[PDB]
Write a protein that binds this ligand. Structure first.
Ligand SMILES: CNC(=O)c1cc(C(=O)N[C@H]2CC[C@H](O)CC2)c([C@@H](C)c2ccccc2)o1
Length: 111
């Protein structure tokens, strides 16, 4: 069972993972494979990795007790991208676009 607010969160999560946003959402689908990408400093800079597959697992496992905890993980995922990457990089542009999708729909949370 989810609260009404956690159903809204699950709706947002489904949208973030949908083909509609795939052009800019794809970097956030799975955990960053730092070694495979040659980003050998990634885990020295990012102490708390997060991605949409981990958010999905936590939602499915009823890990999130409220909307605020869900939103904290989604924003942690974007913050990690903004911390690690140069601000003019394509991946940061993709993060900004997916975060715009997230923030505008999260704002429509039922009272
Ligand atoms: C959550 N993903 C990331 O933070 C991330 C970082 C990266 C990545 O390569 N970062 C660069 C930034 C510039 C620096 O000079 C070298 C490392 C990528 C990959 C996969 C990506 C995604 C999109 C476009 C292009 C490269 O993904």
């Amino acid at each position: 069972k989810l609260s009404e607010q956690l159903k809204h969160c699950n709706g947002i999560l489904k949208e973030l993972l949908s083909k509609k946003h795939a052009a800019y959402a794809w970097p956030f689908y799975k955990p960053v494979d730092a070694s495979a990408l040659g980003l050998h400093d990634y885990h020295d800079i990012i102490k708390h990795p997060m991605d949409l597959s981990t958010v999905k697992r936590k939602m499915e496992n009823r890990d999130y007790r409220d909307a605020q905890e869900f939103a904290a993980d989604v924003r942690l995922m974007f913050s990690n991208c903004y911390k690690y990457n140069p601000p003019d990089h394509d991946v940061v542009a993709m993060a900004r676009k997916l975060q715009d999708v997230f923030e505008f729909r999260y704002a429509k949370m039922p009272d």
